[PDB]
Design a protein around this nucleic acid. Structure first.
Ligand SMILES: [Mg+2]
Ligand SMILES: [Mg+2]
Ligand SMILES: [Mg+2]
Ligand SMILES: [Mg+2]
Ligand SMILES: [Mg+2]
Ligand SMILES: [Mg+2]
Ligand SMILES: [Mg+2]
Ligand SMILES: [Mg+2]
Ligand SMILES: [Mg+2]
Ligand SMILES: [Mg+2]
Ligand SMILES: [Mg+2]
Ligand SMILES: [Mg+2]
Ligand SMILES: [Mg+2]
Ligand SMILES: [Mg+2]
Ligand SMILES: [Mg+2]
Ligand SMILES: [Mg+2]
Ligand SMILES: [Mg+2]
Ligand SMILES: [Mg+2]
Ligand SMILES: [Mg+2]
Ligand SMILES: [Mg+2]
Ligand SMILES: [Mg+2]
Ligand SMILES: [Mg+2]
Ligand SMILES: [Mg+2]
Ligand SMILES: [Mg+2]
Ligand SMILES: [Mg+2]
Ligand SMILES: [Mg+2]
Ligand SMILES: [Mg+2]
Ligand SMILES: [Mg+2]
Ligand SMILES: [Mg+2]
Ligand SMILES: [Mg+2]
Ligand SMILES: [Mg+2]
Ligand SMILES: [Mg+2]
Ligand SMILES: [Mg+2]
Ligand SMILES: [Mg+2]
Ligand SMILES: [Mg+2]
Ligand SMILES: [Mg+2]
Ligand SMILES: [Mg+2]
Ligand SMILES: [Mg+2]
Ligand SMILES: [Mg+2]
Ligand SMILES: [Mg+2]
Ligand SMILES: [Mg+2]
Ligand SMILES: [Mg+2]
Ligand SMILES: [Mg+2]
Ligand SMILES: [Mg+2]
Ligand SMILES: [Mg+2]
Ligand SMILES: [Mg+2]
Ligand SMILES: [Mg+2]
Ligand SMILES: [Mg+2]
Ligand SMILES: [Mg+2]
Ligand SMILES: [Mg+2]
Ligand SMILES: [Mg+2]
Ligand SMILES: [Mg+2]
Ligand SMILES: [Mg+2]
Ligand SMILES: [Mg+2]
Ligand SMILES: [Mg+2]
Ligand SMILES: [Mg+2]
Ligand SMILES: [Mg+2]
Ligand SMILES: [Mg+2]
Ligand SMILES: [Mg+2]
Ligand SMILES: [Mg+2]
Ligand SMILES: [Mg+2]
Ligand SMILES: [Mg+2]
Ligand SMILES: [Mg+2]
Lengths: 190, 88, 145
RNA sequence: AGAAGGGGGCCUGACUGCGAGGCCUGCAAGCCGAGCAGGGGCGAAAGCCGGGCCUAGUGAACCGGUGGUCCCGUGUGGAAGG
RNA sequence: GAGCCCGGUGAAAUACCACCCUGGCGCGGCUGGGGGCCUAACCCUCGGAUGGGGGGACAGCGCUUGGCGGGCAGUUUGACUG
RNA sequence: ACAGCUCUCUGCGAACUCGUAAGAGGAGGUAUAGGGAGCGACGCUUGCCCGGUGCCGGAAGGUCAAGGGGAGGGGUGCAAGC
RNA sequence: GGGAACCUGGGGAACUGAAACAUCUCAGUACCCAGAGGAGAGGAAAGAGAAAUCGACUCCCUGAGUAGCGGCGAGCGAAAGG
RNA sequence: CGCGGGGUGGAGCAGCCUGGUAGCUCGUCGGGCUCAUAACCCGAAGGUCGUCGGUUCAAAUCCGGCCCCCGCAACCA
């Protein structure tokens, strides 16, 4: 309505269920649905999202403080990847196709925050404070969101999942949306 | 063929193309002849007392307007050219 | 095809109304059997005022009831009803009620549209009303000698 | 055959720009082609390579079709169309 | 996404709100095709009818679509050549 | 040409013909009738082939003109739009 | 009703030409019919066309055999402006 | 050039668009039927599901790209 009504997400418990559902065209020729990997997202979030950096057993004093809370090392190569209830989740960059204990034994893998300057500094931002959403087939849409408390200052669901419309080829015209969930879902234009 | 509030008619031709496209390749018309678009007729009775009309077709209503009169008219049998000559 | 109607017809019968139809129905049935007429702004405007020149033409049988209400209401009647106690003698026909209003205050009386069902024929107090629609109930009193 | 033939190695000059000068010739067509410039192939090199030992293996313009480029673009702009 | 569940395990976990592929039903729109009855346009009729019979949105007629169409028309049916 | 035979068309505003039409023949007729076709009194007869052609019959499918239909695309304007 | 041609409207050929011929040409000519009259039509902008322009209409001379039209054949052929 | 339909045991047909497990038919051959035969009855092996590879955990198959096949197509200087 009018703009993109944020506080439209109002009972349940701790309202933290806003969404960004919107369709478009399937696979117009080549491409499809590839939102920005861990986009900035104009939200301080507060999401103490326990992110893991499977870097090394030498980065366990600041890799933990690398924006999340708990981060192990390479002892998760054959000690933690053998079961069905035992086997975020990072990996190794550069070119190392290190997909042995994390590719079959799948939860999150592509590349780790290219920050060899430090695993946790005061100049590096976005490693445990960003989101994404690849494809979804004959049922796309859906993005991340914060809590209920946020005036016309929670305009992050109208810039990361609504501007992430740069991975759309040609063959149709995107349309129909709604920002909400666990409550309902009202729609907003562009 | 007549007209009433309308008019006689035209006798335009009938071109005949075994053409192509110009929006494809070339194109041409084999021939044409003198047609006869017989100005769409039709007749309407109606009443001022009980009159007859070979109304145009387009102007069909038109009559019905002329209908809506009442100018003190009696035994004429005709009584139409009496609406017409005072018609638009 | 806009047209005014007449003899209320089903689907479209709110007399003197406006309804669209296929030229045929009008031009052949409705129109011929004087049950409606062409949208003719003429018969349209003329009709229009055949309403306002009636709406307030009858809205006088209601307007001159408010001038008669703010008067026949309070001001009672007080009839010299020649009676005396028990079962009165000469019942109160409006030929007397109106006769003791018209032929008393020089005011319009309607010895019928008065709400009188029967002559009473006994002394007491009443408050019948002036008919029909909005009504002015004259409070009428009875007396003796 | 003192190769145009038989075999091997790299290559794509079966190029773009042009063309002095001829052959043949009624016109229009057809025919060989030195050499300059451009960037290339093979070679140590002098050099050769603008298709095929050689003559047949094809069809004026008109009309449309696809590509592109600078030009035109009906008051001007851009388009529709040349 | 956790009060209105995980679990264990598998390609994927459910209590709930959603955006939508698959697909049918539920009251409306806009349009369609059909099969019925009608009469009043159009048609035909009846000892002369302001009417009565029967046909009836059909037929007939205007425009436009495609086809059949020597019934008729204009034409074409090469040149060399003892 | 002929009587006579046969196939065939035609339900009456008949089919068919003349005519742009109105109208008229048909016929003031109504299938024991009217038109078209071939054969040609009368006697005995008239075989086989429905692949191709024509015509009669097939409320299924194939193809198909408008028109309806609008997924999708292009032109322009800052735009609502056109 | 008449009237030598002359004018306007309504209709409206073919031979020819293209060295055949069907678009095309001849040609809106011939001729037919109506009508107007000493003439007829046309006539005061819902124009023209690129000029800060022009200013009813009709006739002549140029524009110009240009622009264009065209089985881009034969051939046809303006207008503004002066 | 436009559209859009089919490769499946030897042959000629379903199946997949809802993936998930390849089945009709006829024949090949061996028994059962008489002396034998066609009518017949039964048991059988026989496909990298056209491929270059895109998806899915997994394709005969879901959607494209490709060699014929196959019908509608509209001209043709
Ligand atoms: Mg979709
Ligand atoms: Mg286990
Ligand atoms: Mg042709
Ligand atoms: Mg032509
Ligand atoms: Mg001609
Ligand atoms: Mg109309
Ligand atoms: Mg009049
Ligand atoms: Mg007028
Ligand atoms: Mg070589
Ligand atoms: Mg030469
Ligand atoms: Mg050279
Ligand atoms: Mg060569
Ligand atoms: Mg030519
Ligand atoms: Mg041509
Ligand atoms: Mg322009
Ligand atoms: Mg539980
Ligand atoms: Mg749906
Ligand atoms: Mg509906
Ligand atoms: Mg009837
Ligand atoms: Mg009737
Ligand atoms: Mg009809
Ligand atoms: Mg002939
Ligand atoms: Mg010839
Ligand atoms: Mg000879
Ligand atoms: Mg017959
Ligand atoms: Mg007769
Ligand atoms: Mg004979
Ligand atoms: Mg015999
Ligand atoms: Mg046969
Ligand atoms: Mg047959
Ligand atoms: Mg049939
Ligand atoms: Mg269509
Ligand atoms: Mg727009
Ligand atoms: Mg005269
Ligand atoms: Mg000719
Ligand atoms: Mg010629
Ligand atoms: Mg010719
Ligand atoms: Mg010709
Ligand atoms: Mg003079
Ligand atoms: Mg004059
Ligand atoms: Mg004026
Ligand atoms: Mg002069
Ligand atoms: Mg001049
Ligand atoms: Mg000159
Ligand atoms: Mg001039
Ligand atoms: Mg297939
Ligand atoms: Mg098949
Ligand atoms: Mg095959
Ligand atoms: Mg097969
Ligand atoms: Mg599907
Ligand atoms: Mg079987
Ligand atoms: Mg078998
Ligand atoms: Mg056998
Ligand atoms: Mg067998
Ligand atoms: Mg064998
Ligand atoms: Mg035997
Ligand atoms: Mg097998
Ligand atoms: Mg394989
Ligand atoms: Mg195998
Ligand atoms: Mg298969
Ligand atoms: Mg296979
Ligand atoms: Mg598909
Ligand atoms: Mg072809």
């Amino acid at each position: 309505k009018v703009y993109t009504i944020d506080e439209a997400a109002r009972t349940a418990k701790f309202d933290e269920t806003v969404e960004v559902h919107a369709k478009l065209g399937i696979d117009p020729r080549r491409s499809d649905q590839n939102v920005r990997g861990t986009v900035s997202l104009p939200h301080g979030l507060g999401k103490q999202v326990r992110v893991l950096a499977i870097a090394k057993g030498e980065k366990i004093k600041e890799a933990e403080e690398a924006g999340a809370d708990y981060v192990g090392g390479e002892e998760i190569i054959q000690k933690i990847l053998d079961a069905w209830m035992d086997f975020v989740m990072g990996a190794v960059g550069s070119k190392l196709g290190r997909i042995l204990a994390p590719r079959g034994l799948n939860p999150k893998a592509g590349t780790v925050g290219f920050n060899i300057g430090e695993i946790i500094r005061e100049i590096k931002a976005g490693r445990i404070e960003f989101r994404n959403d690849k494809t979804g087939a004959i049922h796309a849409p859906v993005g991340k969101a914060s809590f209920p408390p946020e005036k016309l200052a929670d305009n992050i669901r109208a810039f990361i999942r609504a501007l992430e419309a740069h991975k759309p080829e040609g063959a149709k015209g995107t349309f129909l949306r709604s920002v909400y969930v666990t409550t309902t879902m009202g729609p907003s234009v562009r | 063929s007549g007209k009433r509030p309308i008019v006689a008619n035209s006798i335009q031709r009938r071109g005949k193309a075994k053409r192509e496209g110009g929006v494809g390749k070339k194109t041409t018309g084999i021939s044409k002849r003198r047609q006869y678009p017989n100005l769409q007729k039709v007749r309407v009775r109606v009443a001022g007392q009980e009159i007859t009309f070979r109304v145009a077709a387009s102007h069909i209503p038109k009559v019905y307007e002329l209908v809506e009169r009442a100018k003190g008219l009696k035994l004429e049998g005709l009584s139409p050219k009496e609406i017409k000559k005072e018609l638009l | 095809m806009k047209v005014i109607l007449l003899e209320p017809l089903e689907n479209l019968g709110d007399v003197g109304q406006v309804v669209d139809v296929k030229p045929g129905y009008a031009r052949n049935y409705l129109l011929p059997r004087g049950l409606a007429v062409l949208a003719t702004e003429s018969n349209l405007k003329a009709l229009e005022a055949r309403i306002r020149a009636q709406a307030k033409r009858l809205a006088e049988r209601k307007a001159e009831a408010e001038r008669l209400k703010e008067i026949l209401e309070n001001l009672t009647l007080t009839i010299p009803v020649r009676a005396g106690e028990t079962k009165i003698y000469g019942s109160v026909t409006a030929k007397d009620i109106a006769e003791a209003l018209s032929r008393q205050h020089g005011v319009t009386i309607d010895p019928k549209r008065l709400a009188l069902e029967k002559p009473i024929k006994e002394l007491g107090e009443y408050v019948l009303t002036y008919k029909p629609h909005p009504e002015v109930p004259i409070q009428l009193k009875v007396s003796v000698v």
